C-alpha cells in the first residue's frame, strides 16, 4: 500500500524496470564493487546501496511458503539495486527518459515494437 | 561484508542508531504515512522510503533457524529505515552530530555517563 | 616525575579525564579506526594517534607484581589516548572548559553536586 | 595494523628513524629536561612528550616472555621520543627531508652510500 | 594493496579491461611492434611500454607455480591492451566505451541492446 | 627482441641499472609505498608503477623453472629502482650519474678516483 501512495503523488516518475529485464542475482552484485571500491568521498546514497546489496547475501546465506517467500523477495530487492546503478551511471534525469521508452516499447504488441531503444551512454 | 568495505572510506559519517534505541517496527510505519502523505513536490528519496517499508511488512506477514532467521532482518530493516526518517525531520547534517553524541554517551560508563543528549533542531 | 615538572608551568590547561570516566580500552580503539580512516589530507597528529594505539594492543596481547604491573599502564594509556579523540571531535579549546567543569562537578559532594554537564559542541 | 592504515594515507611522511639509529635509554631522556625545563608558555605538544617519556621510567622501574616483551617496547617508545625532539629542534618541515635522505643513504649497499648527510642545524 | 591505496584516489580508474575483451597474448605482441613502429616522437611511455611487454616473452620460453604464471601472463595482456586502445583512440574514449560493452553483456539475452558499435 | 627494436632509437637509454647498485627486493617495496604515498597528483605512471611492483609480491608467495624466477624478480627490481631515482631526482640526472659510479668501479683499484658523490 505504501508504494501505491507514492504512485498517487504529483511529479512521481518510474525508475525501476520489469522483473524480466533484471540481471540474475550474485552476478548483479558485482557492479556494487565496481562502484564502491572504485569510489571516494563517501556520499549519503553510497551507504543506501551498501545496506541494500548486502541484504541479498543475508537472504542468500539462508539457503545453506517460508522458503519460497524468501526467494521471491530477492528479485524485488535486485530490481531496486539496478535502478540505483543506472541512477549513477547514466545520470539521474536521463534515466527516467530511458525507462519511459522501455515501458512503451514493451507494452505495445510485439508486432509493433520495432527495435529496442538503446540506453544513453555514460 | 560490503558495509565493512564502505566504512573503510573517507568522509564516512554514520547515520544509524543502535538497534536498542530505534522504535518498534510498528511505530516506524506510522511516521512513514505522515512523511510520505504530508509532502509536496515529490522527490526521489520519497520513493526509496516506500520501497523499503513494504519489505518489513512482507517479512512481518511471513512469520504467521530458518523460521526465526527472517526475524533478524526485520529489526535490522528498521534501523536503516529510521535513518531516513530523522533526515527528513531533523536534517542529514544534524543527525551526524546526534549519533556521535549518542555513541559517546552510550560509550561512557553509566556511573558517570551524564544526561542523555536531546535531539537536534528541526 | 616529569609530568609533575610540566604541571609547574604557565598556560597549562589540563586535557585528561579521570580514569573512572574514560571508556574501556576496547571501546577507544573503535573511534581510532573511524577518526583515522574517515579523514582527508593526513596531518601529523594522525600518525601520533596510531603509534600509541598499537602500544595498548601490545600490552593487551601480553597478558595472555610484574605480571599485573603492565595492566596498570593499559588503563593509563587510554586516558592519554582518549584526550586526542576529544580534540578531533570537539576541539582543543572546548575540551579545556569541559574538563574543568567535570572536575568541579566531581569535586562538589554528591549531595548538592547537581546535574552532570554535557559535552561541548562539535 | 593501525600504523599500516596511516602508511596507506595520502600525504603521509616518515618522521621516525631506524631502531639502530636511536640513542640508548635513560641518557636519551636527558634531552627531555633540556626542552621542558628550558621552556615556557606550555603548549599542547609539550604534554604529549611528557606523558610519553615518563612511560619509559615506569617500564624501567619494573626491572627492580613478559620480561622480554617489556624491554622490546622501550625501544619502540624511544624511537618516537627522538622524532618529537627533532620535530622541535630542526623544525618540523626540514625533518622530513633529513629522514628522507637517511632512508636512501642506508638502504643502498654500503659500497655506494658515500658520506652520511649531516642533519640541518637549528 | 597498492591498488587499494589508489582505489580511493579521485582519478583512479579500472584500466584492467575484461579478460574476454582482450585477445590471446600472441596477437597483442603484434600490435606492440606496429604501434611502436608507427609512432615517431619519443616519450617515456613507449620506452616503458616495450619493457612491460618484454617480460611476457621470457615467460613464453620459460614455460601451483606453473598455473600461477599462466594467469600472470594474462594479467599483463590486459594492461598492455589498455595502452594500445588509449593511444589509438584516447584515454577518455576507452574509459567511456569499455563500460558500454559490459552492460550489453550483463543483460537478459533478449533485451541485450543493439550491438553497440566500437569507437 | 623488442629492446633491439628500440636500441637503435635515438632516445633509447639503458634504464637497467647495475644489479649491484640496487638493493634487495624487499627494501625496494618499502620505497614504493613511500613514493606513492608522498606523491599527490594523479598521473598514469603511478597507476602503472604500482602494477609493475605488484607482480613481485605474487612471486614471493608463489615460491631451471625455479631458478629463472629468482632472476626474473631481480629483473623487475632494477626497472623499479629506475623510476624511483628518476622521480626523486630526475630523468637526466640518473642517466648522468649512473655512468659515473660505474667508471669508478671499472678502474685498477689504486686510481679508482675520489668516491664520486651521489646526486
XYZ file of C-alpha atoms in Angstrom:
726
model
C 0.000 0.000 0.000
C 2.776 2.493 0.781
C 4.227 2.240 -2.728
C 0.747 2.853 -4.131
C 0.528 6.118 -2.188
C 3.775 7.293 -3.790
C 2.445 6.379 -7.233
C -0.530 8.640 -6.440
C 1.695 11.694 -5.928
C 2.464 14.590 -8.272
C 5.720 14.580 -10.211
C 6.454 10.932 -9.422
C 8.396 9.138 -12.152
C 9.261 5.474 -12.572
C 12.891 4.433 -12.146
C 12.719 0.630 -11.847
C 12.425 -1.950 -14.624
C 10.265 -5.012 -15.308
C 11.189 -8.075 -13.280
C 12.103 -9.873 -16.506
C 14.589 -7.148 -17.512
C 16.651 -7.689 -14.366
C 20.028 -9.496 -14.295
C 20.476 -12.669 -12.301
C 21.460 -12.494 -8.613
C 25.037 -12.807 -7.344
C 26.479 -11.606 -10.657
C 24.454 -8.389 -10.440
C 26.163 -7.718 -7.102
C 29.473 -7.356 -8.961
C 28.551 -3.864 -10.164
C 28.345 -2.953 -6.468
C 32.083 -3.484 -6.035
C 32.922 -1.579 -9.220
C 31.042 1.477 -7.897
C 32.011 1.223 -4.226
C 35.646 0.123 -4.459
C 36.295 2.470 -7.401
C 34.981 5.464 -5.484
C 35.941 8.063 -2.896
C 34.347 10.904 -0.923
C 31.654 8.767 0.688
C 28.234 10.205 -0.135
C 24.906 9.511 1.601
C 23.493 7.477 -1.289
C 26.503 5.146 -1.235
C 25.524 3.861 2.207
C 21.978 3.198 0.993
C 23.300 0.976 -1.797
C 25.656 -0.834 0.579
C 22.933 -1.539 3.144
C 20.640 -2.893 0.397
C 23.007 -5.093 -1.620
C 24.320 -6.846 1.494
C 20.755 -7.922 2.312
C 20.681 -10.307 -0.657
C 23.667 -12.177 0.776
C 21.873 -12.454 4.124
C 18.802 -13.909 2.420
C 21.054 -15.963 0.140
C 23.026 -17.229 3.142
C 19.848 -18.866 4.473
C 19.909 -21.288 1.527
C 22.530 -23.301 3.419
C 5.979 -20.923 1.966
C 8.790 -19.643 4.188
C 11.452 -20.968 1.812
C 9.551 -19.890 -1.306
C 8.771 -16.421 0.049
C 12.418 -15.509 0.647
C 13.378 -16.368 -2.936
C 10.670 -14.055 -4.281
C 11.912 -11.139 -2.167
C 15.406 -11.351 -3.670
C 14.007 -10.462 -7.093
C 12.299 -7.359 -5.703
C 15.471 -6.133 -3.998
C 17.534 -6.897 -7.104
C 15.228 -4.673 -9.155
C 15.847 -1.768 -6.774
C 19.616 -2.263 -6.970
C 19.679 -1.875 -10.751
C 17.750 1.396 -10.656
C 20.291 2.922 -8.286
C 23.142 1.795 -10.543
C 21.547 3.463 -13.562
C 20.785 6.486 -11.373
C 24.585 6.783 -11.041
C 25.955 5.601 -14.398
C 23.518 7.273 -16.816
C 22.757 10.308 -14.709
C 19.525 10.589 -12.752
C 17.489 12.697 -15.176
C 18.227 10.763 -18.371
C 17.292 7.528 -16.578
C 13.609 8.471 -16.452
C 13.544 9.078 -20.208
C 15.040 5.646 -20.909
C 12.596 3.781 -18.671
C 9.752 5.832 -20.144
C 10.610 4.452 -23.586
C 11.141 0.942 -22.204
C 7.563 0.829 -20.922
C 6.164 1.880 -24.301
C 8.478 -0.436 -26.247
C 7.314 -3.473 -24.232
C 3.650 -2.732 -23.502
C 2.795 -2.466 -27.194
C 2.344 -5.796 -29.007
C 5.489 -7.390 -30.397
C 4.184 -6.819 -33.939
C 4.541 -3.033 -33.496
C 7.549 -2.544 -31.193
C 10.324 -2.366 -33.782
C 13.800 -2.046 -32.266
C 14.842 -1.771 -28.639
C 15.830 1.814 -27.705
C 19.469 1.788 -26.655
C 20.016 3.332 -23.205
C 22.014 6.574 -23.098
C 25.754 6.248 -22.606
C 27.762 7.468 -19.601
C 30.940 -7.763 4.081
C 30.133 -4.850 1.760
C 29.264 -2.442 4.577
C 32.654 -3.148 6.140
C 34.291 -2.112 2.864
C 32.326 1.147 2.712
C 33.177 2.034 6.312
C 36.807 1.989 5.127
C 36.232 5.231 3.236
C 36.902 8.926 3.727
C 34.137 11.309 4.734
C 32.011 8.472 6.138
C 29.524 9.872 8.665
C 27.432 7.285 10.482
C 23.668 7.787 10.448
C 22.237 4.635 12.098
C 21.347 4.408 15.777
C 21.868 1.300 17.921
C 19.279 -1.430 17.487
C 18.332 -0.976 21.156
C 17.222 2.647 20.624
C 15.259 2.551 17.347
C 11.463 2.343 17.757
C 9.488 -0.830 17.290
C 8.739 -1.674 13.642
C 5.048 -0.870 14.098
C 5.831 2.649 15.318
C 8.151 3.401 12.398
C 5.450 2.755 9.801
C 3.334 5.466 11.435
C 5.847 8.185 10.560
C 6.135 6.815 7.018
C 2.495 7.606 6.261
C 2.785 11.136 7.647
C 6.093 11.919 5.942
C 5.015 10.388 2.631
C 1.499 11.822 2.638
C 2.306 15.180 4.277
C 4.687 16.124 1.484
C 4.575 18.299 -1.625
C 6.622 18.199 -4.833
C 7.511 14.518 -4.577
C 11.267 13.937 -4.515
C 13.314 10.863 -5.482
C 14.133 9.894 -1.893
C 10.416 9.510 -1.148
C 10.212 6.523 -3.493
C 13.149 4.828 -1.767
C 11.467 5.112 1.634
C 8.256 3.446 0.450
C 10.033 0.541 -1.242
C 11.911 -0.427 1.924
C 8.788 -0.039 4.063
C 6.833 -2.737 2.234
C 9.727 -5.162 2.730
C 9.276 -5.102 6.509
C 5.567 -5.823 6.067
C 6.368 -8.738 3.750
C 8.735 -10.248 6.312
C 6.304 -9.364 9.105
C 3.463 -11.075 7.229
C 5.711 -14.129 6.755
C 6.059 -15.074 10.434
C 2.380 -16.028 10.744
C 16.901 -21.249 12.388
C 15.174 -20.621 9.057
C 11.820 -19.690 10.609
C 13.470 -17.409 13.178
C 16.220 -16.194 10.826
C 13.938 -13.777 8.965
C 13.051 -12.077 12.256
C 16.634 -10.805 12.491
C 16.310 -8.831 9.251
C 13.047 -7.221 10.384
C 14.779 -5.492 13.292
C 17.706 -4.521 11.063
C 15.428 -3.113 8.359
C 14.011 -0.613 10.854
C 17.478 0.684 11.741
C 18.177 1.666 8.137
C 14.582 2.817 7.667
C 14.602 5.015 10.774
C 17.731 6.743 9.493
C 15.848 8.350 6.618
C 13.056 9.494 8.948
C 15.438 11.617 11.009
C 16.992 13.077 7.858
C 13.591 14.391 6.766
C 12.647 15.649 10.233
C 15.978 16.936 11.552
C 18.352 17.008 8.579
C 21.323 14.981 7.395
C 23.936 17.302 8.912
C 22.294 17.452 12.338
C 21.845 13.673 12.509
C 25.578 13.034 12.135
C 26.297 15.095 15.246
C 23.448 13.486 17.186
C 24.595 9.915 16.526
C 28.165 10.553 17.659
C 26.895 12.333 20.770
C 24.687 9.312 21.459
C 27.574 6.947 20.737
C 29.932 8.713 23.142
C 27.102 8.995 25.665
C 26.454 5.262 25.347
C 30.186 4.501 25.389
C 30.805 6.254 28.699
C 30.007 4.056 31.729
C 26.600 4.637 33.285
C 28.221 5.651 36.586
C 29.375 8.985 35.114
C 27.576 8.843 31.764
C 25.629 12.058 32.325
C 22.351 13.330 30.972
C 21.293 11.873 27.639
C 21.603 14.491 24.868
C 18.430 15.767 23.258
C 17.636 15.517 19.534
C 18.724 18.392 17.269
C 16.516 21.204 15.998
C 14.022 20.534 13.228
C 58.229 12.809 37.897
C 58.401 14.626 34.552
C 54.659 15.305 34.374
C 54.862 16.950 37.794
C 57.532 19.290 36.420
C 55.405 20.228 33.405
C 52.347 20.927 35.556
C 54.518 23.597 37.210
C 54.258 25.744 34.088
C 52.266 28.735 32.894
C 49.371 28.335 30.485
C 48.936 24.658 31.399
C 45.393 23.543 30.545
C 44.512 20.007 31.588
C 43.055 17.738 28.915
C 42.804 14.291 30.574
C 39.657 12.981 32.237
C 39.629 10.855 35.400
C 40.470 7.195 34.909
C 36.978 6.326 36.178
C 35.259 8.172 33.301
C 37.302 7.205 30.220
C 35.825 4.353 28.145
C 37.112 0.815 28.254
C 40.222 0.224 26.117
C 38.245 -1.851 23.616
C 35.788 0.990 23.002
C 38.534 3.555 22.415
C 40.057 1.591 19.537
C 36.711 1.783 17.733
C 36.905 5.571 17.431
C 40.529 5.319 16.286
C 39.552 3.444 13.127
C 36.794 5.924 12.288
C 38.872 9.027 13.014
C 41.939 7.677 11.214
C 40.071 6.230 8.241
C 37.364 8.914 7.966
C 39.934 11.640 7.393
C 41.333 13.535 4.417
C 44.642 15.354 3.930
C 46.538 13.353 6.539
C 48.010 15.556 9.264
C 50.975 14.965 11.594
C 48.827 14.341 14.675
C 47.194 11.371 12.935
C 50.486 9.468 12.997
C 50.895 10.079 16.730
C 47.460 8.616 17.466
C 48.178 5.377 15.600
C 51.556 4.822 17.256
C 50.098 4.997 20.768
C 47.155 2.784 19.807
C 49.313 -0.212 18.902
C 51.059 0.033 22.278
C 47.835 -0.782 24.130
C 47.325 -3.812 21.886
C 50.891 -4.967 22.568
C 50.346 -4.745 26.322
C 46.861 -6.221 25.923
C 48.280 -9.134 23.919
C 50.904 -9.641 26.650
C 48.518 -10.591 29.471
C 47.528 -13.871 27.799
C 53.547 -7.643 40.675
C 55.356 -7.929 37.339
C 52.543 -9.837 35.616
C 49.894 -7.455 36.966
C 52.096 -4.345 36.739
C 51.656 -3.974 32.976
C 47.875 -3.871 33.424
C 48.239 -0.512 35.185
C 49.773 1.112 32.101
C 46.995 -0.196 29.845
C 44.370 1.807 31.728
C 46.651 4.851 31.811
C 47.389 4.640 28.084
C 43.682 5.048 27.326
C 43.470 8.248 29.376
C 46.121 9.943 27.245
C 44.752 8.312 24.094
C 41.172 9.422 24.758
C 42.384 13.001 25.126
C 43.291 13.229 21.448
C 39.933 11.750 20.419
C 38.011 14.606 22.026
C 40.343 17.168 20.453
C 39.459 15.874 16.986
C 35.734 15.601 17.727
C 35.133 18.639 19.942
C 38.275 20.771 19.709
C 41.204 21.591 21.964
C 39.699 24.825 23.303
C 36.325 23.292 24.148
C 37.898 20.303 25.905
C 39.742 22.512 28.397
C 36.456 24.013 29.581
C 34.747 20.617 29.708
C 37.413 19.006 31.899
C 37.359 21.781 34.493
C 33.560 21.697 34.553
C 33.763 17.937 35.099
C 36.459 18.394 37.741
C 34.427 20.933 39.713
C 31.323 18.795 39.215
C 33.203 15.769 40.542
C 34.772 17.830 43.333
C 31.446 19.018 44.726
C 29.820 16.483 47.089
C 27.160 14.291 45.514
C 24.534 15.659 47.918
C 24.460 19.015 46.091
C 26.638 18.142 43.097
C 23.963 18.960 40.524
C 23.350 17.762 37.005
C 26.405 16.480 35.168
C 27.453 18.932 32.426
C 27.080 17.846 28.824
C 29.943 17.652 26.310
C 30.712 20.754 24.222
C 29.627 21.371 20.639
C 31.369 19.559 17.806
C 47.520 -2.736 11.861
C 46.577 0.838 12.793
C 50.007 2.177 11.833
C 49.693 0.381 8.496
C 46.447 2.242 7.791
C 48.229 5.562 8.333
C 51.017 4.488 5.980
C 48.287 3.885 3.376
C 47.103 7.508 3.514
C 47.820 10.413 1.167
C 50.461 12.957 2.132
C 51.861 10.795 4.930
C 55.582 11.281 5.523
C 58.008 9.373 7.719
C 59.372 11.113 10.811
C 60.944 8.282 12.832
C 64.356 6.664 12.379
C 65.702 3.105 12.189
C 65.879 1.309 15.519
C 69.665 1.148 15.174
C 69.953 4.939 14.775
C 68.360 5.546 18.174
C 70.304 6.622 21.294
C 70.405 4.421 24.357
C 67.670 4.700 27.011
C 67.977 6.795 30.178
C 70.532 9.118 28.575
C 68.107 9.933 25.754
C 65.648 11.116 28.413
C 68.059 13.947 29.266
C 67.007 15.928 26.191
C 63.512 15.892 27.712
C 64.654 18.066 30.614
C 66.560 20.446 28.337
C 63.371 21.089 26.327
C 60.856 21.059 29.183
C 62.781 22.855 31.929
C 64.211 25.379 29.444
C 60.761 26.289 28.167
C 57.712 28.411 28.926
C 54.200 29.009 27.580
C 53.067 25.399 27.891
C 51.897 24.142 24.500
C 49.744 21.084 23.737
C 52.610 19.086 22.225
C 54.704 19.541 25.372
C 52.238 17.462 27.387
C 52.377 14.696 24.774
C 56.153 14.461 25.159
C 55.904 14.491 28.955
C 53.287 11.728 29.056
C 55.413 9.574 26.717
C 58.900 9.970 28.200
C 57.684 9.208 31.725
C 56.381 5.849 30.480
C 59.923 4.549 29.956
C 60.671 5.112 33.643
C 57.518 3.186 34.566
C 58.598 0.268 32.382
C 62.186 0.724 33.565
C 61.038 0.780 37.194
C 59.725 -2.778 36.778
C 63.311 -4.012 36.374
C 63.638 -3.868 40.166
C 58.195 -13.536 27.571
C 56.698 -10.995 29.977
C 60.142 -9.727 30.990
C 61.499 -9.848 27.434
C 58.443 -8.153 25.929
C 58.713 -5.054 28.125
C 62.339 -4.473 27.122
C 61.396 -4.545 23.434
C 58.666 -1.935 23.936
C 61.130 0.570 25.406
C 62.993 0.709 22.094
C 59.783 1.497 20.206
C 58.849 4.325 22.572
C 62.407 5.674 22.496
C 62.209 5.922 18.705
C 59.065 8.050 18.971
C 60.705 10.360 21.511
C 63.583 11.220 19.182
C 61.263 12.157 16.324
C 59.438 14.661 18.515
C 62.749 16.182 19.615
C 63.838 16.674 16.007
C 60.335 17.950 15.224
C 61.171 20.760 17.679
C 64.910 21.369 17.232
C 65.234 21.191 13.432
C 61.794 22.488 12.595
C 59.014 20.150 11.516
C 59.262 20.558 7.742
C 63.030 20.174 7.373
C 62.869 16.993 9.474
C 61.093 15.069 6.716
C 63.799 15.988 4.207
C 66.545 14.724 6.523
C 64.854 11.388 7.214
C 64.097 11.056 3.500
C 67.833 11.180 2.782
C 68.619 8.888 5.722
C 66.466 6.129 4.238
C 68.212 6.376 0.866
C 71.681 6.644 2.415
C 71.168 3.410 4.393
C 69.008 1.270 2.099
C 71.572 1.392 -0.701
C 74.525 -1.001 -0.315
C 77.463 0.273 1.710
C 79.608 0.273 -1.448
C 77.507 3.116 -2.917
C 76.399 5.227 0.068
C 79.311 7.660 0.258
C 79.076 10.091 3.176
C 76.360 10.489 5.780
C 74.169 13.561 5.098
C 74.532 15.930 8.031
C 71.171 16.900 9.564
C 70.148 20.555 9.229
C 71.141 22.863 12.060
C 68.780 24.688 14.434
C 47.380 -3.427 -1.671
C 48.803 -0.595 -3.791
C 45.650 -0.616 -5.921
C 43.696 -0.084 -2.705
C 45.947 2.879 -1.909
C 44.898 4.322 -5.277
C 41.333 2.956 -5.401
C 40.386 5.860 -3.121
C 42.045 8.425 -5.405
C 39.700 10.701 -7.334
C 41.300 9.980 -10.706
C 41.647 6.243 -10.147
C 40.258 4.123 -12.978
C 39.733 0.425 -13.700
C 42.219 0.230 -16.555
C 42.093 -3.589 -16.353
C 39.688 -4.398 -19.169
C 37.638 -7.617 -19.181
C 39.631 -10.770 -19.861
C 37.233 -11.845 -22.617
C 37.642 -8.438 -24.271
C 41.386 -8.791 -24.927
C 42.790 -11.337 -27.422
C 45.382 -14.043 -26.811
C 48.873 -12.927 -25.730
C 50.484 -13.733 -29.083
C 48.231 -11.393 -31.066
C 48.785 -8.481 -28.677
C 52.549 -8.604 -29.219
C 51.878 -7.990 -32.914
C 50.243 -4.624 -32.223
C 53.095 -3.563 -29.929
C 55.524 -3.684 -32.851
C 53.025 -1.919 -35.116
C 52.178 0.848 -32.640
C 55.798 1.398 -31.596
C 56.949 1.351 -35.221
C 54.225 3.759 -36.350
C 54.865 6.209 -33.511
C 57.773 8.603 -34.055
C 58.038 11.117 -31.205
C 59.961 9.740 -28.230
C 58.136 9.780 -24.891
C 58.739 7.755 -21.717
C 55.580 5.676 -22.207
C 56.886 3.884 -25.304
C 60.206 3.238 -23.563
C 58.355 1.737 -20.595
C 55.727 0.136 -22.841
C 58.346 -2.054 -24.525
C 59.778 -3.165 -21.179
C 56.365 -4.215 -19.870
C 55.698 -6.324 -22.968
C 59.206 -7.807 -22.926
C 58.572 -9.745 -19.714
C 55.838 -11.759 -21.437
C 58.370 -13.072 -23.963
C 60.576 -14.546 -21.233
C 57.628 -16.406 -19.714
C 56.843 -17.895 -23.132
C 60.252 -19.580 -23.283
C 60.450 -20.171 -19.524
C 57.365 -22.397 -19.586
C 50.555 -24.115 -8.300
C 53.723 -22.418 -9.550
C 53.152 -23.151 -13.243
C 49.423 -22.403 -13.077
C 50.022 -19.006 -11.468
C 52.406 -17.991 -14.257
C 49.715 -18.709 -16.851
C 47.380 -16.274 -15.092
C 50.222 -13.771 -14.661
C 50.806 -13.622 -18.418
C 47.129 -12.844 -18.991
C 47.351 -10.139 -16.322
C 49.939 -8.206 -18.329
C 47.981 -8.636 -21.570
C 45.026 -6.713 -20.142
C 47.354 -3.920 -19.030
C 49.084 -3.796 -22.420
C 45.843 -3.664 -24.406
C 44.752 -0.632 -22.394
C 47.687 1.461 -23.576
C 47.104 0.226 -27.132
C 43.477 1.361 -27.164
C 44.112 4.580 -25.234
C 46.941 5.583 -27.573
C 44.985 4.804 -30.751
C 41.700 6.422 -29.675
C 42.268 8.216 -26.375
C 42.247 7.807 -22.624
C 38.687 9.069 -22.152
C 37.213 7.064 -25.032
C 38.411 3.718 -23.657
C 37.073 4.568 -20.205
C 33.859 5.750 -21.875
C 33.458 2.770 -24.226
C 34.564 -0.129 -22.004
C 31.522 0.125 -19.735
C 29.053 0.203 -22.634
C 30.006 -3.233 -23.958
C 29.964 -4.725 -20.456
C 26.367 -3.578 -19.995
C 25.335 -5.101 -23.327
C 26.556 -8.458 -21.998
C 25.171 -8.292 -18.439
C 21.557 -8.259 -19.606
C 18.873 -10.951 -20.042
C 19.918 -12.012 -23.557
C 16.674 -10.968 -25.254
C 16.895 -7.267 -24.357
C 20.674 -7.136 -24.733
C 20.576 -3.961 -26.821
C 21.679 -3.199 -30.376
C 25.267 -4.490 -30.502
C 26.922 -1.191 -29.514
C 29.378 -0.011 -32.136
C 33.082 0.269 -31.253
C 34.520 3.788 -31.010
C 63.989 -8.561 -29.339
C 61.845 -5.506 -28.562
C 64.816 -3.868 -26.840
C 66.730 -4.348 -30.089
C 63.878 -2.636 -31.939
C 64.406 0.326 -29.598
C 68.184 0.017 -29.126
C 68.517 1.775 -32.493
C 66.200 4.615 -31.437
C 67.852 7.976 -30.834
C 66.322 8.443 -27.386
C 66.893 4.865 -26.254
C 68.618 4.571 -22.882
C 69.971 1.787 -20.670
C 67.478 2.279 -17.856
C 68.512 -1.103 -16.399
C 70.915 -0.027 -13.671
C 73.666 -2.350 -12.402
C 72.447 -5.261 -10.302
C 74.907 -4.444 -7.513
C 73.632 -0.856 -7.467
C 70.052 -1.746 -6.485
C 69.182 -3.206 -3.050
C 67.333 -6.426 -2.265
C 63.728 -6.734 -3.495
C 62.208 -6.354 -0.026
C 63.754 -2.933 0.602
C 62.633 -1.564 -2.768
C 58.983 -2.307 -1.985
C 59.327 -0.014 1.032
C 60.148 2.995 -1.147
C 57.231 2.261 -3.486
C 54.773 2.862 -0.649
C 56.681 5.960 0.467
C 56.958 7.492 -3.010
C 53.360 6.677 -3.953
C 52.095 7.943 -0.597
C 54.119 11.162 -0.795
C 53.043 11.913 -4.366
C 49.630 13.559 -4.723
C 48.904 14.449 -8.355
C 47.493 11.513 -10.314
C 49.403 10.522 -13.453
C 49.436 7.240 -15.397
C 52.973 6.376 -14.262
C 51.993 5.859 -10.618
C 48.999 3.770 -11.692
C 51.283 1.604 -13.834
C 54.112 1.795 -11.290
C 52.015 0.012 -8.662
C 51.034 -2.739 -11.101
C 54.654 -3.431 -12.045
C 55.664 -3.767 -8.391
C 52.611 -5.888 -7.563
C 53.827 -8.824 -9.658
C 56.881 -9.195 -7.413
C 54.622 -9.829 -4.412
C 52.950 -12.809 -6.090
C 56.319 -14.404 -6.843
C 57.282 -14.034 -3.176
C 54.365 -16.225 -2.094
C 54.478 -18.418 -5.209
C 57.996 -19.614 -4.389
C 65.510 -24.429 -14.242
C 61.978 -23.143 -13.646
C 62.542 -22.046 -10.044
C 65.992 -20.603 -10.755
C 64.679 -18.483 -13.632
C 62.003 -16.940 -11.406
C 64.669 -15.817 -8.935
C 66.438 -13.919 -11.720
C 63.105 -12.586 -13.004
C 62.338 -10.961 -9.650
C 65.699 -9.183 -9.707
C 64.960 -8.038 -13.262
C 61.903 -6.083 -12.124
C 63.762 -4.596 -9.148
C 66.239 -2.858 -11.452
C 63.366 -1.449 -13.508
C 61.509 -0.271 -10.400
C 64.536 1.458 -8.880
C 64.966 3.477 -12.068
C 61.571 5.132 -11.719
C 62.272 5.735 -8.023
C 65.523 7.577 -8.718
C 64.230 9.395 -11.802
C 61.144 10.627 -9.949
C 63.086 11.784 -6.879
C 65.940 13.485 -8.757
C 65.110 13.483 -12.464
C 65.391 11.504 -15.665
C 68.570 13.223 -16.862
C 70.348 13.069 -13.501
C 70.037 9.282 -13.217
C 71.286 8.833 -16.777
C 74.053 11.333 -15.990
C 75.044 9.852 -12.614
C 74.754 6.108 -13.291
C 77.746 6.049 -15.638
C 79.997 7.947 -13.223
C 79.827 5.310 -10.487
C 80.373 2.501 -12.997
C 83.614 4.134 -14.139
C 84.829 4.492 -10.550
C 84.497 0.711 -10.218
C 85.958 -0.369 -13.582
C 89.407 1.005 -12.779
C 92.630 -0.528 -11.396
C 91.713 -0.167 -7.709
C 94.539 2.229 -6.842
C 93.488 5.012 -9.232
C 89.772 4.413 -8.706
C 89.026 8.105 -8.205
C 87.619 10.056 -5.263
C 84.435 8.155 -4.362
C 82.091 10.214 -6.569
C 79.313 11.811 -4.560
C 75.692 10.812 -5.237
C 73.474 13.438 -6.882
